[PDB]
Every structure is written in structure tokens, then in C-alpha cells.
PDB file of C-alpha atoms in Angstrom:
ATOM      1  CA  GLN A 235      83.998   2.918 144.959  1.00 55.29           C
ATOM      2  CA  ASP A 236      80.709   1.924 146.339  1.00 53.53           C
ATOM      3  CA  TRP A 237      77.157   2.104 145.540  1.00 53.17           C
ATOM      4  CA  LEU A 238      76.385   5.416 147.875  1.00 55.22           C
ATOM      5  CA  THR A 239      78.912   7.067 145.937  1.00 52.71           C
ATOM      6  CA  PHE A 240      77.718   5.923 142.280  1.00 51.59           C
ATOM      7  CA  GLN A 241      74.296   7.170 143.237  1.00 49.75           C
ATOM      8  CA  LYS A 242      75.422  10.757 144.460  1.00 50.31           C
ATOM      9  CA  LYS A 243      77.602  11.095 141.344  1.00 50.03           C
ATOM     10  CA  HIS A 244      75.233   9.432 138.835  1.00 52.51           C
ATOM     11  CA  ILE A 245      71.462   9.397 139.549  1.00 52.99           C
ATOM     12  CA  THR A 246      69.075  12.003 139.338  1.00 53.98           C
ATOM     13  CA  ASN A 247      65.628  12.268 140.163  1.00 51.93           C
ATOM     14  CA  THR A 248      64.994  15.182 137.441  1.00 51.83           C
ATOM     15  CA  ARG A 249      65.784  15.222 133.910  1.00 51.64           C
ATOM     16  CA  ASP A 250      66.317  18.915 134.034  1.00 50.61           C
ATOM     17  CA  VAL A 251      69.745  18.590 136.203  1.00 49.52           C
ATOM     18  CA  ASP A 252      70.686  22.477 137.069  1.00 52.31           C
ATOM     19  CA  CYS A 253      74.198  21.726 135.768  1.00 53.78           C
ATOM     20  CA  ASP A 254      75.692  25.407 136.657  1.00 50.01           C
ATOM     21  CA  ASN A 255      74.781  24.516 140.162  1.00 51.09           C
ATOM     22  CA  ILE A 256      75.495  21.036 140.846  1.00 50.88           C
ATOM     23  CA  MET A 257      78.657  20.811 138.833  1.00 49.77           C
ATOM     24  CA  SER A 258      80.217  23.495 140.689  1.00 47.66           C
ATOM     25  CA  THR A 259      79.710  21.863 144.233  1.00 47.03           C
ATOM     26  CA  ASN A 260      82.739  19.981 145.512  1.00 46.48           C
ATOM     27  CA  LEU A 261      81.513  16.553 144.419  1.00 45.01           C
ATOM     28  CA  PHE A 262      81.991  17.089 140.766  1.00 46.93           C
ATOM     29  CA  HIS A 263      84.626  20.434 141.176  1.00 47.95           C
ATOM     30  CA  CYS A 264      83.542  21.934 137.936  1.00 45.53           C
ATOM     31  CA  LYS A 265      84.959  18.888 135.875  1.00 45.37           C
ATOM     32  CA  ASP A 266      84.524  18.652 132.454  1.00 43.47           C
ATOM     33  CA  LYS A 267      81.472  16.195 131.951  1.00 43.03           C
ATOM     34  CA  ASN A 268      79.055  13.956 134.168  1.00 38.04           C
ATOM     35  CA  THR A 269      76.255  11.798 133.052  1.00 39.06           C
ATOM     36  CA  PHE A 270      73.108  11.733 135.391  1.00 36.89           C
ATOM     37  CA  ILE A 271      70.810   9.018 135.287  1.00 37.92           C
ATOM     38  CA  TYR A 272      67.171   9.514 135.551  1.00 33.64           C
ATOM     39  CA  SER A 273      65.699   6.834 137.303  1.00 34.17           C
ATOM     40  CA  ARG A 274      64.847   5.343 140.863  1.00 33.51           C
ATOM     41  CA  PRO A 275      67.672   3.419 142.501  1.00 30.80           C
ATOM     42  CA  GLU A 276      66.390   0.282 142.548  1.00 32.65           C
ATOM     43  CA  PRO A 277      66.341  -0.597 138.700  1.00 31.15           C
ATOM     44  CA  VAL A 278      69.978   0.795 138.364  1.00 29.63           C
ATOM     45  CA  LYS A 279      71.025  -1.049 141.356  1.00 29.31           C
ATOM     46  CA  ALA A 280      69.161  -4.544 139.406  1.00 29.08           C
ATOM     47  CA  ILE A 281      71.619  -4.015 136.575  1.00 28.06           C
ATOM     48  CA  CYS A 282      74.341  -5.756 138.534  1.00 30.22           C
ATOM     49  CA  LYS A 283      72.010  -8.239 140.412  1.00 27.98           C
ATOM     50  CA  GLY A 284      73.760 -11.575 140.662  1.00 27.34           C
ATOM     51  CA  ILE A 285      77.365 -10.193 139.611  1.00 31.57           C
ATOM     52  CA  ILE A 286      79.904 -10.742 142.723  1.00 34.26           C
ATOM     53  CA  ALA A 287      83.515 -10.331 141.462  1.00 33.81           C
ATOM     54  CA  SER A 288      84.255  -6.409 139.736  1.00 34.45           C
ATOM     55  CA  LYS A 289      82.819  -6.617 136.133  1.00 29.94           C
ATOM     56  CA  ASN A 290      81.795  -4.096 133.655  1.00 30.41           C
ATOM     57  CA  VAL A 291      78.121  -4.753 132.310  1.00 30.51           C
ATOM     58  CA  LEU A 292      76.349  -2.605 129.496  1.00 30.38           C
ATOM     59  CA  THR A 293      72.678  -2.170 130.569  1.00 29.40           C
ATOM     60  CA  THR A 294      70.113  -4.630 129.164  1.00 26.00           C
ATOM     61  CA  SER A 295      67.427  -1.686 129.006  1.00 23.16           C
ATOM     62  CA  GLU A 296      67.711   1.945 127.779  1.00 21.86           C
ATOM     63  CA  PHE A 297      67.730   4.825 130.364  1.00 23.31           C
ATOM     64  CA  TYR A 298      67.017   8.508 130.135  1.00 26.03           C
ATOM     65  CA  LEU A 299      70.384  10.193 130.182  1.00 23.20           C
ATOM     66  CA  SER A 300      71.285  13.828 131.476  1.00 21.97           C
ATOM     67  CA  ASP A 301      74.572  15.062 130.622  1.00 21.41           C
ATOM     68  CA  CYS A 302      76.260  18.112 132.006  1.00 22.27           C
ATOM     69  CA  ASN A 303      78.815  19.099 129.248  1.00 25.01           C
ATOM     70  CA  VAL A 304      81.184  21.999 129.788  1.00 22.88           C
ATOM     71  CA  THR A 305      80.731  25.031 127.152  1.00 23.33           C
ATOM     72  CA  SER A 306      83.913  27.410 126.224  1.00 23.79           C
ATOM     73  CA  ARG A 307      83.168  29.117 129.604  1.00 20.94           C
ATOM     74  CA  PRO A 308      84.687  27.474 132.664  1.00 19.54           C
ATOM     75  CA  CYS A 309      82.298  25.961 134.988  1.00 18.58           C
ATOM     76  CA  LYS A 310      79.438  26.942 132.572  1.00 19.27           C
ATOM     77  CA  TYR A 311      77.368  24.010 131.099  1.00 19.77           C
ATOM     78  CA  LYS A 312      74.748  22.841 128.275  1.00 15.94           C
ATOM     79  CA  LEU A 313      72.328  20.224 129.827  1.00 16.77           C
ATOM     80  CA  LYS A 314      71.962  17.438 126.832  1.00 15.88           C
ATOM     81  CA  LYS A 315      69.028  14.716 127.127  1.00 16.60           C
ATOM     82  CA  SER A 316      69.590  11.645 125.569  1.00 16.99           C
ATOM     83  CA  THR A 317      68.281   7.958 125.833  1.00 16.19           C
ATOM     84  CA  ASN A 318      70.606   5.443 125.722  1.00 14.83           C
ATOM     85  CA  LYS A 319      72.387   2.283 127.361  1.00 14.50           C
ATOM     86  CA  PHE A 320      75.355   2.859 129.848  1.00 15.91           C
ATOM     87  CA  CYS A 321      78.273   0.595 130.961  1.00 16.05           C
ATOM     88  CA  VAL A 322      78.640   0.237 134.654  1.00 17.33           C
ATOM     89  CA  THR A 323      81.506  -1.786 137.057  1.00 20.95           C
ATOM     90  CA  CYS A 324      79.262  -3.889 138.761  1.00 26.21           C
ATOM     91  CA  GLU A 325      80.807  -4.906 142.123  1.00 28.14           C
ATOM     92  CA  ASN A 326      78.848  -7.453 144.932  1.00 28.32           C
ATOM     93  CA  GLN A 327      75.511  -6.781 142.850  1.00 28.39           C
ATOM     94  CA  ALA A 328      75.698  -3.173 142.609  1.00 27.89           C
ATOM     95  CA  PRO A 329      76.941  -0.433 140.642  1.00 31.11           C
ATOM     96  CA  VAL A 330      80.438   1.102 141.789  1.00 32.07           C
ATOM     97  CA  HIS A 331      81.657   3.246 138.805  1.00 34.05           C
ATOM     98  CA  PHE A 332      80.085   4.676 135.885  1.00 33.11           C
ATOM     99  CA  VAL A 333      82.115   3.472 132.792  1.00 32.21           C
ATOM    100  CA  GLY A 334      80.741   5.612 129.819  1.00 28.10           C
ATOM    101  CA  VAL A 335      77.460   5.464 127.530  1.00 30.87           C
ATOM    102  CA  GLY A 336      76.576   3.156 124.862  1.00 31.50           C
ATOM    103  CA  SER A 337      79.396   0.639 125.297  1.00 31.41           C
ATOM    104  CA  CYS A 338      81.604  -0.916 127.645  1.00 31.77           C
TER     105      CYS A 338
END
């Protein structure tokens, strides 16, 4: 919905996200999956530069991705690290929603 929420939900300052800890907090409420982007915020915000009306945009660059993926045991996760492009919804020159990995 907005840039601050997007960062809280998707930007990490470690690749080695502690899935079992972070996913169990109220922000993520033990949901099934979440993709974290290992990056300082500013190159992520730059994905949306110049884009005013809501639009989905795939990154030009590859990013380091850390996914928390739920196992067969509720609220227990595996950390999967990967490198890929990802798709965000840009609005008023900022990412406001994460769409998906690899494609819009």
C-alpha cells in the first residue's frame, strides 16, 4: 500500500533471514511464504523512478532474494537463497506492493 510497508515486508539487511523468528511476528502471522530482498532501500526505490500511476514493473537488475518457505510443520520454515529479477507495483515513484519473483 505504501513504501514504508513495502520495506517492512520485503527489504532485509541480512541474507540469512531468521524465518522462524520473523515469520511468526504479527506482520507475517505465520503465512506460507515471503520473499525478502537483500538490498539497501535506495536501489530498490529506484526501480520505480519516474513511474507515477500504479504500474507493475520488473527489475532491470538481478537481486539477492531470501525466501522463507513454510515446511510441512506449521510456522517452521526453510530459508531459500536465490538471485533473480522481481516484479513490484510502482506508484508515485516507489514500490508499494511486491508482485512476484522472475516475472510480472
